[PDB]
Ligand SMILES: *[C@@H]1O[C@H](CO)[C@@H](O)[C@H](O)[C@H]1NC(C)=O
């Protein structure tokens with residue numbers, strides 16, 4: 307996130323940080339007591355050794371990991387979507403399993419999944435989160451950043467993104483003048499949209515041309531299409 | 542980039558491009574492993590030694606332009622054998638522009654239902670992992686199959702307006718059927734809510750008897766396991782219109798304040 311402010315502790319009890327080799331690389335979202343949902347392009351080529359992925363739940367600041375609210379866990383299974391294609395950047399979604407269960411606390415809560423035949427109308431503000439970068443050519447952010455971006459239509463996004471092929475499994479979000487959008491280092495970041503006092507999972511950060519650019523929105527994996535594929539593993 | 546291409550049964554053994562010494566950088570090869578109609582592919586790697594995550598081998602099961610993904614292998618180590626499901630397998634080698642490794646070497650074979658073990662007949666239920674459990678783990682409260690398929694959905698809604706609404710359609714071993722509410726309590730209510738992946742039991746009430754199938758009588762027990770007997774002896778049956786709310790979804794329960802800034 308480049309155009310957002312710091313988040314309050316406990317504001318996003320589902321956004322978790324995935325560390326690969328003592329370094330934050332990708333983000334995920336708590337959906338169950340032992341399962342996660344993240345982008346497949348960041349775990350592409352690392353699903354062979356799930357033990358190298360340590361999930362940090364309830365993370366607020368990247369410098370305070372010994373806090374009692376933080377509950378670290380280890381990954382034992384990484385499932386990449388079968389329809390994924392790194393070249394076309396389509397179906398960019400993957401699930402990661404936890405070794406031990408995590409007790410739901412005041413700072414750790416699972417995110418909600420959009421039900422079947424539930425479409426989000428364009429022009430609707432959906433909040434984002436993640437420990438991304440505050441600028442394109444810079445460094446990461448120690449505090450959990452968050453912002454709010456409005457949704458766009460597939461036709462308008464395809465018209466504004468000619469370098470890519472926006473399929474029906476993608477949902478875009480961003481401002482016309484830019485400035486407020488996610489950037490690199492925040493892969494797998496959720497596109498959280500409130501719906502009747504509930505924050506659904508309306509999108510997983512898939513890719514993007516360039517952040518903080520006018521008329522260059524960010525593309526998110528439409529989770530409403532992969533609802534049954536995610537629920538198949540939650541059982 | 543311009544290495545080998547589609548092969549057939551007489552041509553199984555193939556290197557990547559220069560497996561004896563090392564593969565070049567920025568390579569993008571493809572080995573479309575064809576077969577006969579109804580014969581899958583079993584790709585066994587005789588040797589595998591590549592670079593880190595930056596160099597991977599993507600194995601697909603396309604059969605058309607809508608290709609799927611089977612496995613992504615990288616790094617040195619003996620990789621598992623990939624079992625296809627169609628008569629076409631696409632192997633993509635994506636390499637970086639530095640630190641070139643040796644390569645790999647694999648040969649495939651055709652057959653019928655390779656990988657998937659032979660399902661045992663004569664009333665033997667086979668879960669997704671292949672383990673056989675005839676009646677010892679057929680939705681009874683055990684975990685014989687390690688993949689969790691032995692506890693598959695033996696209960697679901699029926700004629701429901703929204704997602705979290707419907708009937709009490711159950712299934713003991715094979716046949717699906719509804720249930721009655723002669724001794725319906727909140728305990729079994731929240732039990733069947735949790736079994737369907739829902740929250741706490743809400744207001745549930747019948748309307749009128751309409752289904753004549755083998756209805757079941759749900760009973761409670763102090764040990765935790767539910768005892769149900771699908772007996773066809775009941776008058777003025779009550780079809781439970783199960784209306785149960787969702788689980789504890791992403792509701793911010795922290796002590797956040799109000800600040801429109
Ligand atoms: C972690 O949080 C505690 C809370 O008081 C603070 O004292 C400490 O300085 C923090 N550590 C870092 C590295 O920010």
Ligand SMILES: *[C@@H]1O[C@H](CO)[C@@H](O)[C@H](O)[C@H]1NC(C)=O
Pocket residue numbers: 409
């Ligand atoms: C979580 O809840 C279980 C069940 O009450 C309890 O045994 C356990 O101590 C709790 N904490 C952890 C870290 O599992």
Ligand SMILES: *[C@@H]1O[C@H](CO)[C@@H](O)[C@H](O)[C@H]1NC(C)=O
Pocket residue numbers: 429430431454456
């Ligand atoms: C979305 O948020 C922007 C500011 O970030 C605001 O100007 C706009 O009115 C909001 N849209 C809706 C529909 O609330």
Ligand SMILES: *[C@@H]1O[C@H](CO)[C@@H](O)[C@H](O)[C@H]1NC(C)=O
Pocket residue numbers: 470471472
């Ligand atoms: C996007 O892909 C679809 C599917 O092949 C194709 O029909 C369409 O013409 C493509 N659009 C662009 C702009 O490449």
Ligand SMILES: *[C@@H]1O[C@H](CO)[C@@H](O)[C@H](O)[C@H]1NC(C)=O
Pocket residue numbers: 548549550551552
């Ligand atoms: C196997 O490869 C040889 C060498 O190119 C070729 O002549 C032969 O036709 C191939 N066998 C097939 C395609 O079944």
Ligand SMILES: *[C@@H]1O[C@H](CO)[C@@H](O)[C@H](O)[C@H]1NC(C)=O
Pocket residue numbers: 553583584585586587647648649650
């Ligand atoms: C690949 O070659 C090895 C070496 O003999 C062989 O054991 C294996 O069966 C081959 N894989 C096939 C035929 O799928």
Ligand SMILES: *[C@@H]1O[C@H](CO)[C@@H](O)[C@H](O)[C@H]1NC(C)=O
Pocket residue numbers: 699700708751752780
């Ligand atoms: C469900 O709806 C179908 C639609 O015709 C009807 O035939 C059936 O009797 C209904 N079942 C119940 C239990 O209402």
Ligand SMILES: *[C@@H]1O[C@H](CO)[C@@H](O)[C@H](O)[C@H]1NC(C)=O
Pocket residue numbers: 722723724
């Ligand atoms: C409920 O259980 C009791 C247990 O004896 C039984 O007599 C009764 O017929 C059942 N049904 C109703 C509607 O009470």
Ligand SMILES: *[C@@H]1O[C@H](CO)[C@@H](O)[C@H](O)[C@H]1NC(C)=O
Pocket residue numbers: 741742743744786
């Ligand atoms: C049942 O659902 C309704 C829906 O608004 C809710 O108001 C009510 O509190 C729920 N009752 C219980 C017992 O959960």
